[PDB]
Design a protein around this ligand. Structure first.
Ligand code: CHL
Ligand SMILES: CCCCCCCCCCCCCCCCCC(=O)OC[C@H](CO[C@@H]1O[C@H](CO[C@H]2O[C@H](CO)[C@H](O)[C@H](O)[C@H]2O)[C@H](O)[C@H](O)[C@H]1O)OC(=O)CCCCCCCCCCCCCCCCC
Ligand code: CLA
Ligand code: CLA
Ligand code: CLA
Ligand code: CLA
Ligand code: CLA
Ligand code: CLA
Ligand code: CLA
Ligand SMILES: CC1=C(/C=C/C(C)=C/C=C\C(C)=C\C=C\C=C(C)\C=C\C=C(C)\C=C\C2=C(C)CCCC2(C)C)C(C)(C)CCC1
Ligand code: SF4
Ligand SMILES: [Ca+2]
Lengths: 126, 198, 37, 80, 144, 733
């Protein structure tokens, strides 16, 4: 039926994907959101810091970059919240993340983790 | 059962089961039963925050401490960077524990205590008093910020200035006079608008 | 007088350009995908 | 769903049924023509609106007509 | 003639797989299953792309839409002169026989078929849209 | 499952694809196609929509007034309206760098601002506005009017306030009130404002709400009006040395018909405009007593229509039954209204550039060009809409049984003759205009400019001579000093009109030559071809030989399939679709001609246009290539100036136009297959398949694709020409 290849059938990549927080299937959604948010905010703080309009002025490039990354994390959190509200409206085991309450807790955890990751990336450059 | 004006009608979803009901929902945002509980909890916590904030602002002007809109610029015995980190770290656990309380019980709580009442005067009448005082404090905080926006000075100072010349010192004689006058007239006409159509 | 303050554009332009469209887009997006009972 | 209609000018040549790619039309007994057959559309819920049946009709004007109506997963021919 | 029943334990043609197969619609909405009988092993072209080998005897295949099943039916009937039949399967397990609905192919007239959507008039005799205006919804004069 | 949106269409709400949102957005105002819609409900929804539209219009006007009063320089522009550029509003953009900040900081403002090109400064100055307080009060008043209109729209939908269907069909009462009240009384009130405020403010006398009850508009005070000595209001007018806004050289008259233009402002006299509004107010009020409503006297439009059939039967039944087919069809009324409004918009553009009504408007070249182009494009779009609604009327509301033998049925009876003759006229005009152009181009390329065909426009020059222009030398009617028409107006309005028309420095009946003749034929070709497409689409809307039952498929449908040879773009919607391109081309030709002739006029070299407008190479080089040098130099590697926004808008329009060509050339199928591959890619990708769509992704429909491509084409067209026109006219002057 479907096409099987070593890229999608290797046990190493399957274990790597299963080790990711999104494919844990059994932990609290807020913890998953916190982990994903931290991992995303830490990498997100970089481009705004090194390439923004205030990248050449000293003592404020990191400030502006971190604030921009924080705003982006806030926008992504709002996107996650509206996605959860418009996706789960009615109706192994079923993952609790794919539910209204689960996705709302996931979005809140993502917001907290993203802001913490941005703040940690800002102090890591000092 | 008094309503939000002499002769209103409940919008079919504010029958009176909730405390402090007056049939006020023109935008009909509480049409969903699930959203009504969350909005009620949000109203209660906003009222509690406004109550504490209004009492704090009123107490600072009496003693002579800096104004509420300039207290942040004052230098304290700490760093603002560390203050924000501690504030979000404590509130993360506090808000997480408060949210889990609402999912199990449906009301507010402190830490691991859902019905937080060490003294024990949790009555049905006390719950409505909290809502009424919270609503009054929310309007009071909005008034504090608005008075500081156009007049500055302070809330107690604003009340003292109003007693000097009540007929000449008011919102109508201020910089936002015509806007609030037109809004007051439109609001006064509003109950007749709702009663004319029904 | 009706003259707005000097800081009025610095507050209204970001509002109308980012806060209001985000709220409007989020509310409209939730309304479009809402399922009928 | 689309609206497929058969008219009395049909000669029962069965060309529209053979040209249908989703089995929407069929032939039923009739007495209004020499072929003693008439086209029918009992499975219009599966019609996509390709109008191949109109292309295969030889009567002037056509005896089968397809009016594009409401769109669904079947009418849009979506496999996903 | 009686309506056949789907046999889920039916061998499928020899195919190495492709990327044009089933999608999430088969697991959440519905899918289609085509079965046929082959007199010998023969290479045919899959409607989703590629070449498969039908085995001697029963053959079962799955498709995402009814058009793929009918295209395969047309190919098997016109080239190998076979008689295939398909069903619509739902995720709950319900099976619905689709073609040939009455056991006889629709191109040839069969007794018992009741005509549907037949207008006892010609196109030129259709009324004007003004007579159909202000109806329940958008209605064409041919619908009446 | 079934979605809530759209609430007006149950079939669209059950659509599980992305087509549901697009179709719900594009069919929101098609109330006739909504579920469970009746005639009474239809009229009520249109009533509410009308009130909402008025609210939006008034709010937009109040916004313009507020921004000019707040961030503009109206108080400084009134002092020197010749050397001071008007300010639209301030600019607050965090993306601006420092050079952009000092580049846009001009006009005497303290920060970056936009120079207005709408001409509201001249209009407000002419009607009486002098200070920012006046604009602020007007803005607040219009905002209150907008809120009142919005409340009226909401109120007329609630019970005990919804008008019945019979009230909406009272054509006689509505026409009487619109002619007497909406037109006559409004014009009379405008005359009162001009006589009471505009005229005294132009003479240095402030007349506001605080002193208009104690200030007399005329020194005789209503006595000549009641005694019939109306000529006393025309005595002692403004002299030729009157300074606008001051009492130096001012007069005492309030109702004159001097004609011509003011010697300083180069605009029409305020007393003449007041007298004009008074005369049309009396005429409209009188016309408002023609129909019978509730007092026995008056007319019934049905009787006038039924009693208007020729005896020989040349028009068949005449106009019998035309009253019912118009009163019961909203598309017929909308088409008539749009046709008249489009023609009036074109009339406004022509009269406004030729006879400037506002003070110091002719000197503002950018304002004149922008206003003319804006009104002509608006008129073209409205005309296309008028014909589109005529086609919609034929499909949805035309009844051949009720319109049996009248003029309406006879139009469809010989529609082939009309379409064929329109085709012949368009073919002749196109072949000859293009042939003369290519001939002149070959003559100019071979170095023989004396061999090109230059036909003198003797008919239009003859008309210009009839109006009083003595340049051509025809010497007849107003051009001859011994004619009865000339001698009968020498004491009322002919001196000023003749002095203004014989002046070659204004736009009042400009001198024309062979280039004007050729471009006028190009305009005729554009009008005839656009009319041919629109008329053919409206007449073939009910059917044709290829599609005998086209009326059974509605006004807009994709096609009828590839059978019968192919039926792409067979609906009437597609005819309007193809006609929009021709409308844009026609308006482009008229605006190109207007801009080039006025650019050469303002530059002081009309010979450039006279010698380069006869061949297309002159149009491409001397008008498009030459005038775009400053535009494309708005921003370069050496820096930028205040004209960089127009350069960015120029490239912006080019990009939108090219993006439209994509939806115009590539069709659905390719995109649908590509989207299917994208669906497979998203479904087979880990860490991303956890996020699924709510609507199935599908390619845009054929009709939607046409609409999207046309929208991009039109937006790019408009933005590109607007940027070029404003940048060239502002940079040159
Ligand atoms: C939770 C609500 C909250 C609110 C409503 C305000 C509101 C305000 N703070 Mg503030 N703060 C708040 C929390 C906090 N502040 C601060 C630390 C400060 C500082 C350091 C300053 C303010 C200042 C201000 C004022 C002007 C800020 C601004 O954008 O000026 C527009 C520019 C004011 C409106 C400023 C102020 O008072 O200026 C006179 C100021 O200097 N805040 C901290 C510590 C991290 C907070 C919470 O933890
Ligand atoms: C400032 C004000 C505006 C602001 C706009 C702001 C943002 C942009 C908003 C939206 C963007 C476009 C969204 C819609 C895209 C097209 C989708 C569509 O559904 O498209 C298709 C629609 C719908 O068509 C309808 O489609 C219907 C479909 O019915 C089908 O489905 C129905 C429901 O199930 C029934 O079942 C029915 O039986 C079945 O046949 C019917 O066929 C109807 O007959 C048919 O009319 O058609 C149409 O086009 C309808 C639209 C008519 C437009 C007419 C004017 C065109 C002008 C072009 C030039 C523009 C120039 C702009 C210049 C700018 C200068 C600066
Ligand atoms: C939840 C409501 C609330 C909030 C947000 C604040 C916030 C604040 N208070 Mg405050 N306060 C409150 C309630 C509140 N108060 C109440 C109810 C009282 C009466 C008991 C007081 C009495 C009070 C005093 C006496 C002082 C503050 C001060 C302050 C400021 C410094 C914080 C600090 O160091 O001490 C926390 C700070 C911005 C200090 C200050 O900076 O003066 C302006 C100050 O000395 N507050
Ligand atoms: C339709 C008229 C109109 C238009 C096109 C504009 C356009 C603009 N205004 Mg303005 N404004 C208007 C009316 C208008 N205004 C009116 C009537 C007022 C008096 C209350 C103001 C008060 C105002 C202020 C104080 C400021 C602007 C500013 C601005 C600029 C920044 C963008 C912005 O929207 O800010 C915000 C505009 C507003 C908050 C006014 C909106 C208030 C009305 C009553 C609501 C309109 C609702 C609208 C019609 C609904 C459709 C929107 C959407 C849902 C489709 C922009 C050029 C800013 C500026 O100058 O930048 C330099 C600025 O500081 N405006
Ligand atoms: C129409 C409204 C609008 C407004 C008001 C802004 C405003 C801004 N833009 Mg933006 N932009 C817009 C539309 C708008 N944009 C659109 C439509 C596009 C697509 C064409 C872009 C594409 C764009 C890009 C590519 C960039 C900007 C950037 C910027 C920032 C300038 C950086 C600077 O010099 O200051 C200094 C910056 C700071 C001091 C950091 C402030 C960080 C944020 C703004 C504050 C915190 C966020 C806030 C709390 C949450 C807001 C979310 C809200 C919607 C809920 C500035 C705040 C630049 C930027 O983001 O800077 C990195 C930049 O790279 N914009
Ligand atoms: C004297 C009484 C009266 C008056 C003043 C009006 C006035 C109006 N009616 Mg109404 N009506 C009346 C009686 C009246 N009606 C009666 C008795 C009936 C029942 C039979 C109706 C039934 C009725 C219906 C069903 C509708 C209206 C509508 C309208 C509005 C039309 C909107 C418009 O086109 O703008 C105003 C138009 C003009 C001012 C005329 C413009 C003249 C030309 C076109 C322009 C030239 C002027 C000049 C050169 C340009 C100015 C230059 C510069 C200022 C820019 C308008 C405000 C519509 C509506 O509801 O809107 C909410 C509509 O749907 N009326
Ligand atoms: C008094 C003016 C008037 C009125 C009341 C109507 C009313 C109506 N028209 Mg009509 N029309 C008009 C003028 C008018 N029209 C004009 C001037 C044109 C020429 C352009 C047309 C051409 C036209 C056609 C071809 C059709 C209609 C149709 C309709 C009917 C419903 C469609 C609808 O509105 O849904 C909603 C309309 C939209 C959602 C419009 C889409 C958005 C457009 C393309 C604007 C895009 C501008 C763009 C965003 C600018 C951005 C630039 C910036 C970002 C840089 C409706 C009764 C349709 C019909 O009758 O159905 C069968 C029909 O097909 N009209
Ligand atoms: C520069 C592009 C262009 C040109 C030249 C035309 C030309 C024409 N269009 Mg057209 N149109 C265009 C773009 C163009 N269109 C676009 C983009 C659209 C939107 C899709 C439309 C949509 C459109 C519609 C809907 C209609 C037309 C119609 C017409 C014809 C009008 C009659 C006429 O003017 O006679 C003059 C003839 C010409 C200008 C053709 C050129 C003659 C050549 C140059 C002479 C032959 C050269 C030489 C002797 C031989 C060379 C051949 C070589 C291989 C040896 C005409 C042929 C209408 C029509 O058909 O009228 C009946 C019609 O209804 N057009
Ligand atoms: C200038 C007009 C234009 C533009 C912009 C495009 C753009 C595109 N075409 Mg296309 N095409 C065009 C003309 C155009 N085409 C014409 C006239 C035809 C007919 C022959 C075609 C036929 C065609 C085919 C057959 C195909 C494409 C494909 C594509 C896509 C390629 C992917 C890509 O380039 O990545 C990036 C996108 C761009 C570079 C476009 C510009 C995007 C800008 C620079 C980004 C701005 C972002 C900004 C922040 C947005 C904020 C807005 C704000 C209001 C919020 C792309 C979106 C191919 C495809 O499907 O994709 C694989 C494809 O197969 N086109
Ligand atoms: C399709 C259709 C339709 C139609 C439309 C149309 C019709 C359009 C058009 C068109 C147009 C747009 C037209 C216009 C016109 C105009 C005219 C017809 C005119 C005129 C003229 C005159 C008569 C003048 C005279 C004079 C002169 C010469 C100058 C001086 C002054 C005087 C006055 C002497 C409708 C909707 C109805 C419906 C049905 C269908
Ligand atoms: S193709 Fe036409 S004539 Fe032939 S069977 Fe079908 S409907 Fe009848
Ligand atoms: Ca004044």
């Amino acid at each position: 039926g479907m096409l099987e290849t070593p890229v999608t059938s290797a046990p190493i990549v399957a274990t790597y994907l299963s080790n990711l927080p999104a494919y844990r299937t059994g932990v609290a959604p807020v913890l998953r959101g916190v982990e994903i948010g931290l991992a995303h905010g830490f990498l997100l703080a970089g481009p705004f810091i090194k390439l923004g309009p205030l990248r050449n002025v000293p003592e404020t490039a990191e400030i502006a970059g971190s604030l921009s990354a924080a705003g982006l994390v806030l926008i992504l959190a709002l996107c996650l919240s509206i996605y959860g509200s418009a996706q789960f409206q009615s109706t192994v085991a079923r993952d609790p993340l794919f539910s209204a309450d689960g996705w709302s807790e996931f979005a809140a955890g993502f917001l907290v983790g993203g802001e913490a990751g941005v703040a940690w990336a800002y102090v890591c450059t000092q | 059962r008094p309503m939000w004006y002499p002769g209103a009608t409940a919008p079919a979803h504010l029958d009176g089961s909730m405390l402090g009901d007056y049939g006020f929902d023109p935008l009909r945002l509480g049409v969903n039963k699930d959203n009504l509980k969350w909005f009620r909890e949000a109203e209660l916590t906003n009222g509690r925050w406004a109550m504490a904030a209004v009492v704090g602002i009123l107490f600072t002007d009496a003693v002579g401490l800096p104004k509420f809109w300039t207290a942040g610029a004052e230098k304290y015995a700490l760093d603002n960077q560390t203050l924000a980190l501690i504030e979000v770290a404590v509130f993360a656990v506090l808000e997480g524990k408060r949210y889990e309380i609402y999912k199990k019980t449906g009301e507010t709580g402190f830490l691991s205590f859902a019905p937080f009442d060490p003294m024990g005067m949790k009555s049905e009448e006390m719950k409505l008093k909290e809502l009424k005082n919270g609503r009054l404090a929310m309007l009071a905080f909005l008034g504090f910020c608005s008075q500081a926006a156009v007049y500055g000075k302070g809330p107690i100072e604003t009340l003292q200035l109003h007693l000097a010349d009540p007929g000449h010192n008011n919102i109508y004689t201020s910089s936002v006079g015509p806007e609030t006058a037109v809004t007051v007239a439109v609001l006064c006409v509003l109950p007749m608008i709702i009663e004319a159509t029904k | 007088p009706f003259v707005p303050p000097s800081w009025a554009p610095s507050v209204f332009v970001p509002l109308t350009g980012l806060v209001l469209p985000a709220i409007a887009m989020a509310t409209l997006f939730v309304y479009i995908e809402k399922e009928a009972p | 769903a689309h609206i497929v209609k058969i008219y009395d000018t049909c000669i029962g040549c069965t060309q529209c049924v053979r040209a249908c790619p989703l089995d929407v039309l069929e032939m039923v007994p009739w007495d209004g023509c020499k072929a003693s057959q008439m086209a029918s559309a009992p499975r219009t819920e599966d019609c996509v609106g390709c109008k191949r049946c109109e292309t295969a009709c030889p009567t002037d004007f056509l005896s089968v007509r397809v009016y594009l109506g409401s769109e669904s997963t079947r009418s849009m021919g979506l496999s996903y | 003639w009686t309506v056949p029943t789907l046999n889920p334990d039916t061998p499928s043609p020899i195919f190495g797989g492709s990327t044009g197969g089933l999608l999430r619609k088969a697991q959440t909405e519905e899918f289609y299953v085509i079965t046929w009988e082959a007199k010998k092993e023969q290479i045919f072209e899959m409607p989703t792309g590629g070449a498969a080998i039908m085995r001697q005897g029963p053959n079962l295949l799955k498709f995402g839409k009814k058009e793929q099943c009918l295209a395969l039916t047309t190919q098997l009937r016109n080239k190998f002169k076979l008689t295939p039949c398909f069903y619509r399967v739902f995720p709950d397990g319900k099976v619905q026989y689709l073609h040939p609905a009455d056991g006889v192919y629709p191109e040839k007239v069969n007794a018992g078929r009741v005509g549907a959507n037949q207008n006892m008039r010609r196109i030129g005799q259709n009324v004007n849209p003004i007579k159909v205006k202000f109806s329940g919804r958008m209605m064409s004069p041919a619908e009446i | 499952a079934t979605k809530l949106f759209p609430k007006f269409s149950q079939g669209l709400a059950q659509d599980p694809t992305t087509r549901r949102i697009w179709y719900g957005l594009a069919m929101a105002h098609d109330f006739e196609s909504h579920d469970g819609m009746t005639e009474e409900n239809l009229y009520q929804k249109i009533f509410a929509s009308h009130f909402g539209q008025l609210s939006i219009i008034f709010l937009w006007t109040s916004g313009n007034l507020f921004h000019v009063a707040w961030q503009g320089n109206f108080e400084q522009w009134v002092t020197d309206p010749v050397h001071i550029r008007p300010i639209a509003h301030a600019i607050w953009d965090p993306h601006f760098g420092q050079p952009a900040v000092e580049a846009f900081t001009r006009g005497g403002a303290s920060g970056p601002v936009n120079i207005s090109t709408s001409g509201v400064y001249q209009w407000w100055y002419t009607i009486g506005m002098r200070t920012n307080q006046d604009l602020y009060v007007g803005s607040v008043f219009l905002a209150l009017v907008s809120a009142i209109f919005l409340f009226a729209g909401w109120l007329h939908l609630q019970p005990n306030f919804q008008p019945s269907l019979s009230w909406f069909k009272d054509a006689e009462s509505r026409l009487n009130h619109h002619l007497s009240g909406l037109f006559g009384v409004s014009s009379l009130a405008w005359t009162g404002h001009l006589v009471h405020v505009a005229i005294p403010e132009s003479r240095g006398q402030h007349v506001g709400w605080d002193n208009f009850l104690s200030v007399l508009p005329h020194p005789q005070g209503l006595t000549p009006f009641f005694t019939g000595n109306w000529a006393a209001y025309a005595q002692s007018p403004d002299t030729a040395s009157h300074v606008f806004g001051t009492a130096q050289g001012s007069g005492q008259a309030i109702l004159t018909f001097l004609g011509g233009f003011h010697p300083q402002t180069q605009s029409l006299w305020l007393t003449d405009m007041a007298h004009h509004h008074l005369a049309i107010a009396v005429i409209f009020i009188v016309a408002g007593h023609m129909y019978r409503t509730n007092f026995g006297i008056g007319h019934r439009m049905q009787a006038i229509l039924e009693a208007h059939t020729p005896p020989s039967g040349s028009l068949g039944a005449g106009h019998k039954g035309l009253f019912d087919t118009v009163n019961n069809s909203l598309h017929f009324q909308l088409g008539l209204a749009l046709a008249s409004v489009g023609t009036i918009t074109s009339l406004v553009a022509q009269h406004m550039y030729s006879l400037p009504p506002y003070a110091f408007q002719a000197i503002d070249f950018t304002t004149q060009a922008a206003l003319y182009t804006h009104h002509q494009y608006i008129a073209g779009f409205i005309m296309c809409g008028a014909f589109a609604h005529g086609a919609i009327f034929f499909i949805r509301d035309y009844d051949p049984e009720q319109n049996k033998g009248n003029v309406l049925a006879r139009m469809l009876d010989h529609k082939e003759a009309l379409i064929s003759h329109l085709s012949w006229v368009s073919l002749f005009l196109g072949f000859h205009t293009l042939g003369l152009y290519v001939h002149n181009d070959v003559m100019q390329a071979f170095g023989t400019p004396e061999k090109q065909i230059l036909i003198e426009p003797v008919f239009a020059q003859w008309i210009q001579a009839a109006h009083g222009k003595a340049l051509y030398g025809f010497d007849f009617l107003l051009s001859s000093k011994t004619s009865a028409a000339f001698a009968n107006g020498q004491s009322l309005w002919l001196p000023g009109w003749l002095d203004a028309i014989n002046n070659n420095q204004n736009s009042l009946f400009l001198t024309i030559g062979p280039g004007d003749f050729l471009v006028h034929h190009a305009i005729a070709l554009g009008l005839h071809t656009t009319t041919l497409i629109l008329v053919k689409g409206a007449l073939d809307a009910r059917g044709s030989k290829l599609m005998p039952d086209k009326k059974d498929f509605g006004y807009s449908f994709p096609c009828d399939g590839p059978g019968r040879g192919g039926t792409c773009d067979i609906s009437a919607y597609d005819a309007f679709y193809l006609a929009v391109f021709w409308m844009l081309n026609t308006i482009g030709w008229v605006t190109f001609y207007w801009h080039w002739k006025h650019l050469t006029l303002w530059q002081g070299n009309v010979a450039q246009f006279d010698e380069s407008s006869t061949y297309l190479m002159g149009w491409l080089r001397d008008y498009l290539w030459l005038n775009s040098s400053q535009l494309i130099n708005g921003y370069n590697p050496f820096g930028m100036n205040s004209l960089s926004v127009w350069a960015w808008t120029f490239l912006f329009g080019h990009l939108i136009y090219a993006t439209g060509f994509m939806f115009l050339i590539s069709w659905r199928g390719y995109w649908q297959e590509l989207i299917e591959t994208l669906v497979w890619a998203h479904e087979k990708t880990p860490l991303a398949n956890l996020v699924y769509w709510k609507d199935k992704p599908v390619a845009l429909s054929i009709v939607q694709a046409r609409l999207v491509g046309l929208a991009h084409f039109s937006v790019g067209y408009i933005f590109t020409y607007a940027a070029f026109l404003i940048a060239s006219t502002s940079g040159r002057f």
